[PDB]
Design a protein around this nucleic acid. Structure first.
Ligand SMILES: [Mg+2]
Ligand SMILES: [Mg+2]
Ligand SMILES: [Zn+2]
Ligand SMILES: [Zn+2]
Lengths: 79, 57, 97, 55, 74, 126
RNA sequence: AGGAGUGGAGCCUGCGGCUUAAUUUGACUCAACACGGGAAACCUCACCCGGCCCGGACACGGACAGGAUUGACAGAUUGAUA
RNA sequence: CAGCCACCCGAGAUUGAGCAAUAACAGGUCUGUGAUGCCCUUAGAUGUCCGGGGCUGCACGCGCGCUACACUGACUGGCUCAGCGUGUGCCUACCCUACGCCGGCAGGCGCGGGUAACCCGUUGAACCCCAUUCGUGAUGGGGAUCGGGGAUUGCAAUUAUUCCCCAUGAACGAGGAAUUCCCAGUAAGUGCGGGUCAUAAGCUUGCGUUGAUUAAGUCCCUGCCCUUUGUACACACCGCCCGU
C-alpha cells in the first residue's frame, strides 16, 4: 500500500543516512565527502563526491558497478 | 514532527533534553488541462527535495 | 558450517552471477530473500560467505546490520573451478563498460 | 529436538522483539514515526535524517 | 566471579558416539546360488522413500529413519 | 466432618464432568485459561499423573512426578496426585488435596525464603 | 515581601540496610537517589538453579566410501514431543 | 554623554526558547554501537538458546512524588467551553476509531471511514457554572487494607498485569527541628496529548483551561565573581611544615 507523509519523509531520511554511512565506510580512503540522492521518474541517481574519482570508479568502472549492485540488493530498488 | 530525547548517552548529570524538529509543508494546485499538457508542465526539472504527485480527480 | 551441498552451490551461483552479495546479520531468519524458493537459511549464507572471506575470495564490509561481499579475482577463479564454468563466463560486475 | 527448541520462545511484542536498526541494542528505542533507532543512534543521525534543532 | 564448581550436578555428560558398522551386507541377500537377491529388510512405502531406502526391524515395529514412519508388529 | 464440595458439587460429579462444565464452576480466569485451551506439555503432565496414579499400589500414595509448570489444578483428576513443583531451584513435594481445585501449582511451591531479619549494619541510618 | 508548599499520614516510586540460590549493577553534595529514557510476568537480562547447540573461520596432519548427519519406540527427563 | 524614570500614541515600549568563548574535571558512560587498547573466558563456555527462580523479597533509615485531613467541601442530576498532537508499521506480530445491536459494568458482536485541514472530530476535557441532599464528625470527609465474583491482553497473570462490581472501611483534625521552587497569562488548581506501550502512568515531556497574593529592592544568609593585601603554597591549604 502507501504510508503517511510523515513516515515517508522519516524513511527517506533514514535511507539517506544509512547510504551515507555505508559509503563512508567503503570510500574513506578515496576522499569520500558526501552523497546526493536525486529521484527522477523510474530512476534514482546517486552522486558520490570524492577527491579521487578514478579510485572510486575502479578499473573499467568495476568498483562503481559493484557499489550499484550492492545498493540495488540492499534497499530493494527494482533491478 | 517532534522528538525529545535525553542529551546524555548515560543517565548522569542535569537532565537536559534535545527538542528535535522536522517540518513538512504541503501545497495543492488544481488546473483544467489535458493530461499531456500536465505532463509537460510537471517535468520541468523541479528543485530537489520537493515531492510532486499528480492525481486525476 | 555443516550445510547441504545444494545450499552452498546455490549461494555460489548467486555470488558468481552478480559478483556481490548482501545479507542481514541475523542468524534466525529462515530464508535469504534473494535465495528464497531454494530454502537457503540466512545463517548458511553468512557462514559460507565468511568461509570465502577467510580464504581471501571476497571482501566484506559491514554497516547498519548488513554484510556486503564483493567477489575478488582469486574468488572468481576459485568459483569458476568449483562450479566448472566455461572460461568465457564472467560475473555481471566485469561486463558493461 | 533442537530444531523445535532453538529460538522457540515467542517474540512478537516485548522488548525482545524490537531492536535498533543501527546497533541492534534493545534499550531506549524510539518507535515514533517508524525510526526504530535507540536514543544515542538517533542523536548521532538526526541531522542526516532531517531532524534539526530550532527551539 | 567464582568458579562454577558444578561437580554436584553430574560428572560430565558423555556425548554420543555412533557405533561403526562395516557394510550393508545384511540388507541384501543374493546368495541364491542363482543370482537371486532377496531383500532381508522391508522397504519404505513413502513417496520419497522408494526402493533405495529400507526400514529397520527392532524386537518390535518397523522404522524408517528417513521419514520416521513406524509400523508396529502387533 | 462432611464430604468435600466445590461450588455445591462434590468429588464424584467433579470427576464425571467435562471441561465445558468445569468452566462454569471455575472462576473468571481458570475459565479463560481453559477456554483458550490446555496446550501440550500440560497434557503431558496430566497423562504422567494418570499413569502414576494407575501404577500406584492399593492404599499407597502415587509416586511423585516433578514439573516446572505452574499449571491448573484441574478437576480432581489431579487430586490425590503427588507432584513436585519446581520453585526455581528445588522440586517441592506437594500432595493435591480437594480444596486446592481452581488454584495454581505455584501457589504451593514458594520461590523465596521468608525473611527473618538480622541486626542493621553499615550505613543503615547513614 | 510573600505564594504553594514538604519535612508529619497512607500509598506509589528510586537508594541504603537486612534477607536471599539469586535478590544483576552503574551513579553518593550542588555535579547520585520517578536517573541510566530503568513502567523487569516470558523476552528484556546482566543474577540464581538446571539442560540442549556451535553459529570452534582458515591452515597443517589423522580417519574416510563409508568421514560424518538426522531420527520413530521404550527407558530417561532426577521439567519438555531435548 | 552613556543611560535611567514617568507619560502619550501604539498590537506590542523587557515573549519564551535554541546556539553558545579560553581553559579545566582523573565528573558520567567500555551497560548505545560492527567505537575502542590491554587483560580475562572461550565447548561439562563469561558465546548462545530453553525450562523454571531473581530483579518486588522487609524489624529499619533516606530521596522524588500521588491522595488527603473537608462545607471556599463531598455526593446526585442539569448546563456549557480547549489546545498541542497521534493514528493501518522493512524486518514487525501490534493503528485511531464513528455508527448499529447485546450487557449495570468492565466488555462482546457486526458494519463502515481514515496512510489523514478529507475519518475519529466541530476533538460535547476537567476544573468551573446551576440545582440537589448532607450538617461540624474521622461524617455521606478520606480510601489504605482485605474478601467474594466478572471481563480484557497475552504462550503463561500465582508473588495477585490491567479493568469492572459488591463488600470491608486504617492512619490522617493541616504536620517539630530543617528545607525547595517561584515576579504575569507566572505560582497554584484542572484536565488533555506524546514517550514507554501485547497488556499499562502516581513518571517524564508538551498542551491548553481558571487564574492570584506580594516585589520593582539588598548583600543580612548562601554562594560566586573581582580588586588590594599576605604567603615559607606552585601536585598549589586535601598545601607546606615542627618537635618528643
Ligand atoms: Mg552576600
Ligand atoms: Mg616550591
Ligand atoms: Zn542504536
Ligand atoms: Zn520412509
Amino acid at each position: 500500500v502507501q504510508i503517511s507523509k510523515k513516515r515517508k519523509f522519516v524513511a527517506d531520511g533514514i535511507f539517506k543516512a544509512e547510504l551515507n554511512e555505508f559509503l563512508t565506510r567503503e570510500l574513506a580512503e578515496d576522499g569520500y565527502s558526501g552523497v546526493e540522492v536525486r529521484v527522477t521518474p523510474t530512476r534514482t541517481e546517486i552522486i558520490i563526491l570524492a577527491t579521487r574519482t578514478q579510485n572510486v570508479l575502479g578499473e573499467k568502472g568495476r568498483r562503481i558497478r559493484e557499489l550499484t549492485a550492492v545498493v540495488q540488493k540492499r534497499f530493494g530498488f527494482p533491478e | 514532527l517532534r522528538i525529545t530525547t535525553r542529551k546524555t548517552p548515560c543517565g548522569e548529570g542535569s537532565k537536559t533534553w534535545d527538542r528535535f524538529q522536522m517540518r513538512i509543508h504541503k501545497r495543492l494546485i488544481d488546473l483544467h488541462s489535458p493530461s499531456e499538457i500536465v505532463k509537460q508542465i510537471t517535468s520541468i526539472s523541479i528543485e530537489p527535495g520537493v515531492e510532486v504527485e499528480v492525481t486525476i480527480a | 558450517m555443516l550445510m547441504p551441498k545444494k545450499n552452498r552451490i546455490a549461494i555460489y551461483e548467486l555470488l558468481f552471477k552478480e559478483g556481490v552479495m548482501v545479507a542481514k546479520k541475523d542468524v534466525h531468519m529462515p530464508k535469504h530473500p534473494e535465495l528464497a524458493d531454494k530454502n537457503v537459511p540466512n545463517l548458511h549464507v553468512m557462514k559460507a560467505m565468511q568461509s570465502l572471506k577467510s580464504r581471501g575470495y571476497v571482501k566484506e564490509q559491514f554497516a547498519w546490520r548488513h554484510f556486503y561481499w564483493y567477489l575478488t579475482n582469486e574468488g572468481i577463479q576459485y568459483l569458476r573451478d568449483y562450479l566448472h564454468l566455461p572460461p568465457e563466463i564472467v560475473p555481471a560486475t566485469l561486463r558493461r563498460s | 529436538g533442537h530444531q523445535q527448541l532453538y529460538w522457540s520462545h515467542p517474540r512478537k511484542f516485548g522488548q525482545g522483539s524490537r531492536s535498533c536498526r543501527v546497533c541492534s541494542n534493545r534499550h531506549g528505542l524510539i518507535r515514533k514515526y517508524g525510526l526504530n533507532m535507540c536514543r544515542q543512534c538517533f542523536r548521532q543521525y538526526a541531522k542526516d535524517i532531517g531532524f534539526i534543532k530550532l527551539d | 566471579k567464582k568458579r562454577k564448581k558444578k561437580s554436584y550436578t553430574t560428572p560430565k555428560k558423555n556425548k554420543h558416539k555412533r557405533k561403526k558398522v562395516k557394510l550393508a551386507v545384511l540388507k541384501y541377500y543374493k546368495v541364491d546360488e542363482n543370482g537371486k537377491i532377496s531383500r532381508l529388510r522391508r522397504e519404505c512405502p513413502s513417496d520419497e522413500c522408494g526402493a533405495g531406502v529400507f526400514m529397520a526391524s527392532h524386537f518390535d515395529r518397523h522404522y524408517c529413519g528417513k521419514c520416521c514412519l513406524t509400523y508396529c508388529f502387533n | 466432618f462432611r464430604k468435600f464440595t466445590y461450588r455445591g458439587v462434590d468429588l464424584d460429579q467433579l470427576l464425571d464432568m467435562s471441561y465445558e462444565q468445569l468452566m462454569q464452576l471455575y472462576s473468571a480466569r481458570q475459565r479463560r485459561r481453559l477456554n483458550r485451551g490446555l496446550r501440550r506439555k500440560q497434557h503431558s503432565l496430566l497423562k504422567r499423573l494418570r499413569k502414576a496414579k494407575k501404577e500406584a499400589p492399593p492404599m499407597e500414595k502415587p509416586e511423585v512426578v516433578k514439573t516446572h509448570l505452574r499449571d491448573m489444578i484441574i478437576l480432581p483428576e489431579m487430586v490425590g496426585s503427588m507432584v513436585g513443583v519446581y520453585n526455581g531451584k528445588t522440586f517441592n513435594q506437594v500432595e493435591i488435596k480437594p480444596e486446592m481445585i481452581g488454584h495454581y501449582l505455584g501457589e504451593f511451591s514458594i520461590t523465596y525464603k521468608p525473611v527473618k531479619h538480622g541486626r542493621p549494619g553499615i550505613g543503615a541510618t547513614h
